[PDB]
Design a protein around this ligand. Structure first.
Ligand SMILES: O=C(O)c1cc(C(=O)O)c2c(n1)C(=O)C(=O)c1cc(C(=O)O)[nH]c1-2
Ligand SMILES: O=C(O)c1cc(C(=O)O)c2c(n1)C(=O)C(=O)c1cc(C(=O)O)[nH]c1-2
Ligand SMILES: [Ca+2]
Ligand SMILES: [Ca+2]
Lengths: 571, 69, 571, 69
């Protein structure tokens, strides 16, 4: 709304999790730069009093900061003039059983803000609007039902007078949908499902008119056998982007359910799709399915980054996105035209390549998955070559700094029944480091990319996956947190590490920045968890547990322990 | 199955060699229970009704109450 | 043993929780001083992955640091060359029920070291010796039985080839005793009980020969009616001191049980006693009962500080101690002679004064407790004007920097039966700030004292109780953590605050210091809890809950939340 | 009762005015059960035996085992 716009236009404020409507996750604040970053020190810290993975990052509105924890999803409001005083706090009362239907740790990716309210959700499915100054609950509504395996983890997204909120639960057969609510009252405006009839999916009359070969009408049911789409997944628990001029919001729908591909023949549209929907009606102007008939759990929910750059010398309105499937996509955000579809690392083998003309992945049968067969050395793994991390874009050099994962896998599915409220996976995995790390053990990378060509500029390897993402600040610095507990700053020119601080626990969110009384501050959550930390968090040791994640990250607990809090830095 | 043979635009799925074109009746038949399949829709219907009541009550009373009945 | 002595004599090492055998909790490291403390910054941090109160402080042996958490009592070994790597760790498997019989949060006051081993205990009563380099368990024995309400929280204490360990549980009628074990094998050498026959209490033939009026033989039973001494408390869960030349160790025994004084007529010896015992035999050379027939839960377990200073011009081997009862005691540590017994704050009203000739408190009936009566405005409260905090002593200016509590109370007892495994308190309290704070709301003080006169030199007030204690370093600095989350440094000359840092959560341990690669580091645990934080930690709101502590500390949760870890600072 | 009137050195307790010198038989009689009172000693005896066994086995075998029997 107008109030959110006011904050967005306020220098040094941070009212949106992804850094702005275009979700470039960057900042013009340049007080901290390449020459003085070595002098950055901790300013203060704040513990949430909660363990488990602490995703997302705090919001800064005016002189107030809002911090959030993992389940039970607590909110803490602080006035930057005195970080020692909790102005107000909201501590939800939720049934412990809520955690039992959360697939990948009891994480929360953050708060949102609009109309002078902090918009927050709870894992148990409630969405609330609290007064930003007092914490008073203005409205509280139900969005997801944990009894059928549906929960809330993603950050809400505010645009105009609408709050976009998507439920999680594809691992439990939850049929995904982006739900839209009135920012002032919490009333349901509409919801656009990822599968089913065109009416339920909310497709515009001219849906994909620019690219009919992507598929248009009737595919939400025609690309499934019978009613399999009813428990077909497609949940959107990642991030959104919004272009005010076009009045289009963008996001990606998740993986189809179950993981057992043999149980759901068909392209399974519209799961794994990049969307361009009208904000007012939710009607899709365009939709591009990145991974038809998923066979690897490449949940297509990753960040959408909107930029305006010259493509072959021609200024173009773009949308860029690095999917779990290891492909960096760049499309025209107005009509959905496919411009770039390149592998972020040569290890990607599920596809020989993505054909720009047919618009689909040229599949390599050797790395497919199917019943009564154990696929091996498949890249990327289900954790993908990119997950929930929020990357940053430098508008000057026109570079995206991507936090990647370099993990591959073995996979064999198996038959299982669907029972609402219970998991519906149907696959056994083994995950391990990809083949290209310097010592073949590295699982993380910070890799810079030109979004108009998909070509990399440089790479910095990390022992563990770069799960949280990166933040770019005008001083020429790429900030990011590691699973082993460090907040780091790199020279955006070559990836050279210029500064680091050992936080209490690994970070799984992306850094944020703000200004307060003449100084630039860098904020990062800490508290390892999420999918990579399930072994440590839930005391698991079986390599196959955590769907293969436990074995892959077995060494993480030798570098970090759980935690939960925020650390702030400055000069 | 390389994804490049489409029966119709946007519908390029093909059964892999040795696997059926239709799983109903095959050894890969999921045999899903319609009652279970419809549970999400049923829950959403009830949930939408509960929210509608909260919205209506808040509008008429001027104060928002989650537990209104 | 000899190995411990080697570490004690190693500049920059920290092998003993209290700073050394005399427990002066100080350091000759002067790199950080009054002139440059303003430049101190966070060096690194480490989360334990555990919540609840994090008492004590880490140990530093050579280039290795050992960190400990609250229950389940985990141990983490880090080499200072790379704090990011956990060389080895020990994470105990204990029954969750153990927490149910712990009176005052599931805290752990620290590790000990001897014969190349880290000596660690567990709340469930186990005491272990682990190789300091590999973490291999050399021995593990049972010391306390949680089934009868006995647990372990205090830090073990190593002297020569002996490990001293005392069980907690007076609130559950546990009969206290100092248990002595062989450092190499874990074999029980002997145990000296706080109540009962002289044989069980282990009194030397010349016990109190220098002060017969203190009482000598047969009082362990004669000052009780019948067998009430069997469940008479007297647990020692505080700190120890040791004089190698005299081969005497010192400590204080706790409060008698139950809290209901009417249920246990008699002086209740030897609870509330300052002891001087031979290390090899455990036989007491002298014993001074500070609080005969306790009526306020003034558990006499506080720190014992050994110093050698002139008393009115004559050099004397001293022992100083600030009891829960609000009295600062200084005795001759060789024979037990009473030299000083002054109120640490004029608000103390349970006693008119302590008579130096009779050696006993001159009780004021107006502030006693008894059945069918509600005592009001009694000072100190059960939390005492001093609790488990470890204070520091500056040998140059000869000053003790005490972390005090300024809390008083209302108290009324009630009858209740004894059942092993169940609480045995029998009193309802109300606690609130003392009458002398600047705004009459302050509950904490850092007060400097001359131990030979008991007179104060200066006072710095704190909103909340100074629970953790203080550390003194030669640069002229008094370091301490606050319940609201700050680590602070004061000018030791006047108490002026020179530096502070907002840690993630309140600190309830005392700071430690060490040197590595020519640099001085200050280390402090963080993670609020203990008695002051029971309201926040256990979600309590009843003001009378936590035995009155909840009401008194109702505002703490508006300044801090739980946490668990270590923060290290340096220039 | 100011603690200054001692019947014997180190034994200065006095009943407060209006309270009994001995609580046995009074309205403040704790009526503690003898067997219940001895529970701690009984526990320590058994515990000491378990430790003795661990110590003995460690010395004869050369390896320390907590659960030995
Ligand atoms: O299908 C879904 O609805 C769903 C939900 C979530 C979530 O909301 O945490 C994850 C995933 N899938 C899973 O694909 C995944 O890779 C994942 C990682 C994490 C995390 O926070 O580390 N969450 C999720
Ligand atoms: O009687 C006992 O054995 C016993 C044990 C403990 C403990 O070990 O934590 C405390 C106390 N009493 C109690 O007197 C007290 O003031 C207290 C505070 C704390 C703390 O860590 O904050 N523990 C204890
Ligand atoms: Ca998924
Ligand atoms: Ca006590």
């Amino acid at each position: 709304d107008a109030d959110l716009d006011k904050q967005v236009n306020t220098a040094g404020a941070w009212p949106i999790a992804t850094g702005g409507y275009y979700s470039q996750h960057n900042s013009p604040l340049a007080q901290i730069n390449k020459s003085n970053v070595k002098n950055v020190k901790a300013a203060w810290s704040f513990s949430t009093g909660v363990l488990n993975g602490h995703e997302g990052a705090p919001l800064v509105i005016g002189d107030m900061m809002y911090v959030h924890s993992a389940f039970p999803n607590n909110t803490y409001a602080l006035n930057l003039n005195d970080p020692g005083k909790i102005v107000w706090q909201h501590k939800p009362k939720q049934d412990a059983s809520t955690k039992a239907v959360m697939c990948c740790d009891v994480v929360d990716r953050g708060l949102a803000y609009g109309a002078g309210q902090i918009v927050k959700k709870q894992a148990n499915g409630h969405l609330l609007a609290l007064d930003a100054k007092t914490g008073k609950i203005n409205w509280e509504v139900e969005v997801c039902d944990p009894k059928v395996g549906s929960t809330l983890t993603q950050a809400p997204f505010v645009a105009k007078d609408t709050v976009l909120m998507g439920c999680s639960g594809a691992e439990l057969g939850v049929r995904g949908a982006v739900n839209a609510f009135d920012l002032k009252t919490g009333e349901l405006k509409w919801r656009a499902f990822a599968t089913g009839s065109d009416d339920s999916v909310r497709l515009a009359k001219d849906f994909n008119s620019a690219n009919p070969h992507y598929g248009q009408f009737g595919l939400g049911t025609k690309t499934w056998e019978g009613d399999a789409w009813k428990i077909g997944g497609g949940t959107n628990w990642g991030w959104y982007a919004y272009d005010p001029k076009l009045n289009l919001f963008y996001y990606g729908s998740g993986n189809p359910a179950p993981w057992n591909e043999t149980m759901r023949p068909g392209d399974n549209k519209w799961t794994m799709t990049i969307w361009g929907r009208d904000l007012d009606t939710g009607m899709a102007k365009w939709g591009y399915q990145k991974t038809p008939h998923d066979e690897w759990d490449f949940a297509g929910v990753n960040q959408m980054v909107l930029t305006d750059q010259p493509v072959n010398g021609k200024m173009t309105p773009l949308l860029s996105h690095i999917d779990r499937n290891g492909i960096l996509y760049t499309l025209n955000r107005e009509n959905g035209n496919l411009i770039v579809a390149e592998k972020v690392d040569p290890a990607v083998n599920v596809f020989k390549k993505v054909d720009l003309k047919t618009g689909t992945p040229v599949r390599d049968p050797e790395f497919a998955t199917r019943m009564d067969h154990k696929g091996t050395n498949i890249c990327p793994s289900a954790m993908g070559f990119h997950n929930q991390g929020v990357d940053s874009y430098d508008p000057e050099s026109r570079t995206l700094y991507a936090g990647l994962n370099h993990i591959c896998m073995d996979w064999e599915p198996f038959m299982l029944p669907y029972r609402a409220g219970q998991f519906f996976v149907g696959a056994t995995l083994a995950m391990y480091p990809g083949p290209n790390g310097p010592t073949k053990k590295e699982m993380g990378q910070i890799r810079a990319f030109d979004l108009t060509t998909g070509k990399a500029k440089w790479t910095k390897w990390e022992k563990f996956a770069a799960w949280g993402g990166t933040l770019y600040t005008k001083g020429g610095l790429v900030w990011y947190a590691t699973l082993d507990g460090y907040l780091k700053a790199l020279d955006n020119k070559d990836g050279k590490e210029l500064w680091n601080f050992k936080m209490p626990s690994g970070g799984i969110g992306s850094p944020m920045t703000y200004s307060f009384k003449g100084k630039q501050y860098i904020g990062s959550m800490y508290g390892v968890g999420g999918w990579p930390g399930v072994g440590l968090v839930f005391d698991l040791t079986d390599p196959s547990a955590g769907l293969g994640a436990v074995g892959a990250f077995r060494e993480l607990q030798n570098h970090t322990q759980m935690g939960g809090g925020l650390m702030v830095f400055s000069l | 199955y390389d994804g490049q043979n489409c029966k119709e635009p946007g519908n390029c799925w093909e059964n892999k060699p040795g696997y059926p074109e239709k799983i109903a009746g095959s050894k890969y038949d999921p045999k899903h229970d319609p009652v279970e399949l419809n549970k999400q829709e049923e829950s959403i219907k009830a949930m939408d009704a509960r929210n509608a009541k909260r919205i209506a009550n808040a509008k008429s009373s001027g104060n928002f109450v989650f537990d209104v009945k």
